[PDB]
Amino acid sequence: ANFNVPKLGVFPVAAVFDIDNVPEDSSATGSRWLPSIYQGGNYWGGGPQALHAQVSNFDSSNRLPYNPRTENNPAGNCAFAFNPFGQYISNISSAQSVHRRIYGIDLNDEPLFSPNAASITNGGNPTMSQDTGYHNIGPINTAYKAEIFRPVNPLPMSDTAPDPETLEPGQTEPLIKSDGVYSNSGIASFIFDRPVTEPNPNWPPLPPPVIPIIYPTPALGIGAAAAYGFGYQVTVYRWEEIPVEFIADPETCPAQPTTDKVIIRTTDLNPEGSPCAYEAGIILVRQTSNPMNAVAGRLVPYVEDIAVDIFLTGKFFTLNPPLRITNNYFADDEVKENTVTIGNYTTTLSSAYYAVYKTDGYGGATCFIASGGAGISALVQLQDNSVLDVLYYSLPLSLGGSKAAIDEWVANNCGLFPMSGGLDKTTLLEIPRRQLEAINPQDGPGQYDLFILDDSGAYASFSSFIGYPEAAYYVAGAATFMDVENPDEIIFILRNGAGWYACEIGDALKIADDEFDSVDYFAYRGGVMFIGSARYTEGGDPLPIKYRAIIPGL
Amino acid sequence: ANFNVPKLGVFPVAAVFDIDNVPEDSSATGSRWLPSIYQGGNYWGGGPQALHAQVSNFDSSNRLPYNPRTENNPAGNCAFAFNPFGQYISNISSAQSVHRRIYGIDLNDEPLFSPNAASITNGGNPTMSQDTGYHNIGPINTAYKAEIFRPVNPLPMSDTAPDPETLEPGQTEPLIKSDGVYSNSGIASFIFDRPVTEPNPNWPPLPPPVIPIIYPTPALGIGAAAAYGFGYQVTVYRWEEIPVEFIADPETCPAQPTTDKVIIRTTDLNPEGSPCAYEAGIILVRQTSNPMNAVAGRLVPYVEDIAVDIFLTGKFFTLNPPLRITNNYFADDEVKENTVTIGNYTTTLSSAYYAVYKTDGYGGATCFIASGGAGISALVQLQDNSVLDVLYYSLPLSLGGSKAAIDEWVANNCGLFPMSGGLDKTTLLEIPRRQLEAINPQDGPGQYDLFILDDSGAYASFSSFIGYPEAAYYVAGAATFMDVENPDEIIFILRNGAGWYACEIGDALKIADDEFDSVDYFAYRGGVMFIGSARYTEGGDPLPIKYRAIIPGL
Ligand SMILES: [Ca+2]
Ligand SMILES: [Ca+2]
DSSP states (O other): OOEEEEEEOOOOOOEEOOOOOSSSOOOOOOOSSSHHHHHEEEEOOOOOOOEEEEEEETTTTTTEEBBBBOSSSSSBBOOOOOOEEOOOSSHHHHHHHHHHHTTTTTOOOOOOOOOOOOHHHGGTOOOOEETTEEEEEEEEEEEEEEEEESSOOOOOOOEEEEETTOOOOOEEEEOOOOOOOBBHHHHHHOOOSSSSSOOOOTTSSSSSSSEEEEOOOGGGEEEEEEEEEEEEEEEEEEEEEEEEEEEEESOOSSSSOOOOEEEEOOOOOSSEEEEEEOOOOEEEETTOOOTTTEEEEEEEEEEEEHHHHHHHEEEEEEEEEEEEEEEEEETTTTOOOOOOEEOOOOEEEOOOOOOEEESSSSSSSEEEEEEESSEEEEEEEEEEEEEEEEEEEEEEEETTHHHHHHHHHHHHHHOOOOGGGGEEEESEEEEHHHHOOOOOOSSTTTTOEEESSSSSSTSSSSSSEEEEEEEEEEEEEEESSSSTTTEEEEEETTSSSSSEEEOOOTTTTTEEEEEEEOOEEEEEETTTEEEEEBBBBBOOOOOBEEEEEEEEEE | OOOEEEEEEEEEEEEEEEOOOSOOOOOOOOOOSSSTTOOGEEEEESSSEEEEEEOOOOOTTSSOOOBBBBSSTTTTBBOOOOOOEEEOSHHHHHHHHHHHHHHTTTTTTTOOOOEEEHHHHHGGGOOOEOTTSSSSEETTEEEEEEEEESSSHHHHHHHEETTTTTOEEEOOEEEOOOOOBBBBBOOOOOBSSOOEEEEEEETTTTSEEEEEEEEEBBGTEEEEEEEEEEEEEEEEEEEEEOOOOEEEEESSOOOOBBBOEEEEEEEESSSEEEEOOOOOEEEEEEEEEEETSSSEEEEEEEEEEEOOOOEEEEEEEEEOOOOOOOOEEETTTEEEEOOEEEOOSEEEEEOOOOEEEEEOOOOOOEEEESSSEEEEEEEEEEEEEEEEEEEEEEEEEGTTTOOOHHHHHHHHHSSSOGGGGEESSSEEEEEEHHHHOOOSSSOOOTTOOEEEEOOOSSOOTTOOOOOEEEEEEEEEEEEOSTTTSSSEEEEEEESSSSSSSEEEEEEEEEEEEEEEOOOEEEEEETTTTEEOOOOTTTTTTTTTTEEEEEEOOO
């Protein structure tokens, strides 16, 4: 819906000041502290302050561990979602490791974890990376480390052949059944801001409700997970004895081998005796210190299930291109230059693909910077050359690197929108509600209602504006005319849309007779206007930008 | 030895310029681009350029891998020596691992390496650290990784009891002899700029002379070493047979157990036969598909030596506090501010303990900075806000953090010395040869000869100087008088010690009648003098420093 805005008057000039005590900036390169009239889409301006972000060359060494900032982990610095998961797949090989490990056959043995590839890619929002330097199972590198192996049920042991001297059946580890049934562990998902916990079996009424098993280390991007039910089968041998009996010559041995006992046939020439043929598989053990005291039986095989829960950790991170943000502004009658870096900045690769800044005009600024068109980005709170806070986000690929789209995303996820770029001139000056009011960064009902300023048709449509929402006004600079004999004017719009005013500054911009400086850089703060004017020579060479300060009567 | 220096004259002033277009600096905080007359010991000045180094807060995450810069590894960035070494100590435990590993009983088994603690401490010059995240042998973390296990001689195998069906003696791994002899590996020292190599057995005349075994990765601080002769003993069993013979009823078995053979006694009721008692230890194997075809013998134990060479890598680093260097200078009639960072600078902890800068007056500078009084330091080559090169050193503890001592050390190891601080006034102006000549940073013969300037007694002994060796002169600023009615003068000394000149600048420093500005900041470049004068109010409050430029007639 459209809303007419009447021109209520012309604010006169109360004073004009020069600014000849500042670093010289090339009219060809731009002002280091004053935003150009073409940069409204990069700001939520608050004064004569300018920012610029640069991206450092980077490699796989510049890592950002997954340290999620949550109610449970308020010290984390990652705002983007990430939910990796995987399983311990059961097969002869992995089962070997688990078996040798739980039975103490070798404490170095460990099964390799199988992460779900897609969960690591994380939809590229952002693309995550597994830190394979975190651990190694022998010659194999892996981003996962099994912390605890817990058999669901006590590990069984098989008996051995009775001891010659003791006549006692020993013990040994069951034997993995190669052609047995393998069950994969359940789904193991990593958590970073709390420990893995199992319901306290005694919960109602005794505390605590849950029992922590293992803990993650979010600062190092280490998550914690539980992979239940890893299963495989083993063969257990139980010694099942059969009676041993004696007979003596002349009695004869059975015509057929014995199957339910062993018979020992004694003679005169051999009072000790010799056993009658017995079914293969039967084991006879003659006690050495009393051969006439032997026992017999078989080591019968039994198939059994071995289930184990495995708790493990995983190390993750994403690439994070070091940044360098220049933050310069005017104050105390001089220019304050400030620089700050994030990460191990080395050499500049380029300027940041996207960057929007909300400033207070005094070195204060909260910004959103994405080195690329998608992926890792930083929501940064800063003051001068000091980084107060940093929270990372990720720009979805579905934005196709669209400034307009990104603007809305940043608006919706971070409450930031370039309020300084709404003014435009076609047949008349116009600006959507959102920017004019400059209070709600998000799109919404009435947010796109158009405020059209009556009596502004004389201005050129190619005029460019950068506005400053302060107090009752939205002050935007750069209403230019097709006729240079007509000096640029500053526009003062009421944020309630009641009406607007212009401020003719033809005098302040007057260099020669019938010749004025154009407004190319503009800012408004504390009721003071700051102007920057491009400059060149008769020949056409770039010169230092002209800086003035103009105070309007309000 | 002393050398008289006559006053040859007074250079007049050819021109005076003001500098009112620069950032305001507090007379209480200092000039951001002009070295104070009290900072000669911090520079080898070349113009109106000032540097300052800050140290960032740091923890164990700020690591500097041991990457030595050598003819073989010119891309390395470490100049300090480091020679870690250790051994693989032989004992039942480590031997177990080596045995199970070389015989393939388990490829995850590995012996832990024992580094020589003192070699890691490295005399604290600097203190090195082992990266235990590099590898793990099961639950144990270790900065070392065995790459190759190479038995000095083919691994022996012991025979087993002949197979029932096949009647063939098998094989199995020898048995480690617990109470055996253990030999430690030889001395294993890590190298970083080349691979470990063994003489090519065929060298004369066939190439290459040596054979690379394993390679280090200096960029990651990974060294490579060879630990020869790790030794332990094992018991090997060789199947030594004895003949098997038959006899038949009525013949009788020997009265005593057989010790050199086995006798099988057949009968009518048992055509197969029963063996006559035989010495314990003897093993009889009756072929199942022909019991009358059995063999006998013993599994005789033999002690043997097992030696193995182990090649391994180790990951090392030292703590490296991120740095931030401000580099500002005057040029093109304005002040050029530049900042640069090294490492992941976060928050400032303090100013660098020690720092000396050789400047060219145009943003160019090569410096030596040590965040602390001893330890890791950086030799840095820079231009404006760009780090050209960085080479790390370590300041020996034996310097006790002595500026004077450090100065000499830096002089001797890096060819850098604060040439700007030699001038001094007692009864007369005086300066050692080294600084006056400003060509050889190191101490040496004649380097401490004193040049005394005649006719300079009127100056105050509390005068402070910062000199600039350029072309034929050593221009130092700040010859002050006890009587303020007498303005400061700049001293121009000939580097060949032929004589000196003064430059009276009472006019340029004249603010009021019978009142002048004192020279508090000074620099000389391209025949132009740059002055900074402290300022205050009648009340005594700090004001902006006054800056002028004075050209002398030469
Ligand atoms: Ca337009
Ligand atoms: Ca003195």
